[PDB]
Each structure stands twice: as C-alpha cells, then as structure tokens.
Copies of this chain bind each other. A is one copy, B any other.
Amino acid sequence: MLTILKLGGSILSDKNVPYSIKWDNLERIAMEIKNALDYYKNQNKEIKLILVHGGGAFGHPVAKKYLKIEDGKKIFINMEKGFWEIQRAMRRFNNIIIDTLQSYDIPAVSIQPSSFVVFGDKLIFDTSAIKEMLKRNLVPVIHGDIVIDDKNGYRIISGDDIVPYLANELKADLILYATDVDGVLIDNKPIKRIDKNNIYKILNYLGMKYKIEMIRKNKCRGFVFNGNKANNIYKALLGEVEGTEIDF
C-alpha cells in the first residue's frame, strides 16, 4: 500500500558543488520510479508513494551562511534574511526534482515544511493534507527545509526526521533509504540486517547513527541501499532487498 522512498541528498546533487544537479542520475531515478509505479498498475495493485529528498547542494551551502559557532554550538543569525534564502534554495531544488518526476508522468506535488512544520520539543507537522493527497494517488515530494523551533528558534529538519515521523504517523508498509553506499557499512561491509540482537554492538561501532536510531524509536523497518546502481530503486520499490535491513 504505502511506501516512502528517501532520495539521499547525494545521488541527486553533489554536495561539494554548490547548486549542482546530477541530471542523468536524477532522470534515471525518475524513470525507475515510473517503471515501478507502472509495474503496480499492471498487477492492478494500488500503491501509495511519498518521496523525500535532502538539501543536496542547495540547502546546505546556503544554510551555512547563517550558522556560526557560538561555543561549539550551531547558531542561526540574520534569519530576517536567512529564513527566506534557505526557503528559496530549497524551492529551486524542490522544483527541479518535481518537474523531472512530472516529465515521467509521475504525479508529484510539493510539500514545503518551512510553511507549517514546527520542530518543537514535540514535533509539529499536520499530515492531513498529505493523507488526502494520497487518497488521490498524488505523490507528495517532501524536502529537508528550514523550520521554526519554538525552543531554539530555528532548526534544519532533515529527511531522516521527516521519513520516520511519516512512516509512523501514516503507518507506512515499506521504508526506503536510497543513497551512495550499498547499505550500512561495518568495517566496510554492508550488514545483511539489523535487529534487537546485533544492534547493541553497532551503536557502539558508530545510513548513519541518527537514522538507525530514530527509525527503531518508531519500531520501523526500512532498507538502506545504493541509489547509484542502475535498477536498485526500481527493485527496492517492488519489495526486493539489495542493502541493509533495519527491523524494529
């Protein structure tokens, strides 16, 4: 029924190249998603799909201009300008991704967190709109953004936040983390799986820490795999496993 596919801010834009886009990779990814959705239409199987991407070479480079170290602590200043400028950057990125998805007849739509998400001690994030969108078989595309934080003023909600939240808030059947590594790497090897068992000895060794952690905190079950290898995204969507499983 409901799958959430995160596109790791990396396979979409080169983070060391401010304002860059990996066009061919992006166009391939859109195609695989399209082929996947098409596959389901054939099996006459109804699938609901949400998409998340990061700030890639857009969010971060601009955010940077408004983060200064106040004694080992990231601080946002000049947000009278910074809030918009970070919104704008993320909008450019969001537009580019949605347009490309659209060119493949993928019914993508923009979800812009900065407008309504408050990263308060208790995350505030009304999903009413998204649930409706899913009833119409639209594909909400959500992105890491700048958001208000009723405690610290501003925060940079990331995909790793949105994904688990929504998976749980919406009861997602499948969770996908597309990225530039074949899965969670230990000693440079993608562990086949991650449970309640070998978990303990992994948090220690330490998808990164942040993820794994608040994706067990929601008792989720997602796959971390490589979005750069042609066909991986397609397969991932059909309920295959090509990377690291994280069950909770």
Question: Could you tell me which A residues sit within 8 Å of B by CB distance?
Answer: 79-81, 83-84, 87-88, 91, 95, 98-99, 102, 105, 107-118, 124, 126, 128-129, 132-133, 135-138, 147-150, 152-153
Contacts and interface: CB of A to CB of B under 8 A. Distances in A.
Contact of A84 (B80, B84, B110): B110
Contacts of A112: 110, 112, 115
Given A112-B112, A126-B116, A107 B132 contact: no
B116 A80 contact: no
Given A84-B109, A102-B84, A109-B114, A128 B132 contact: no
B109 A83 contact: yes
Contact of A150 (B88, B95, B126, B132): B132
13 contacts: A80-B107, A80-B138, A83-B133, A84-B98, A84-B108, A84-B109, A87-B109, A112-B112, A112-B115, A115-B116, A116-B116, A118-B132, A136-B152
Contacts of A147: 129
Given A128-B118, A129-B147, A136 B109 contact: no
Given A84-B102, A84-B108, A110-B112, 8 more contacts: A83-B138, A88-B99, A111-B116, A112-B115, A115-B116, A118-B132, A129-B147, A132-B148
A83 to B, nearest CB: 5
A25 to B, nearest CB: 21
A91 B110 CA distance: 10
Contacts of A98: 84, 88
Nearest to A135: B152
A87 B110 contact: yes
A114 B110 contact: yes
Nearest to A79: B136
A115 B129 contact: yes
B81 A102 contact: yes
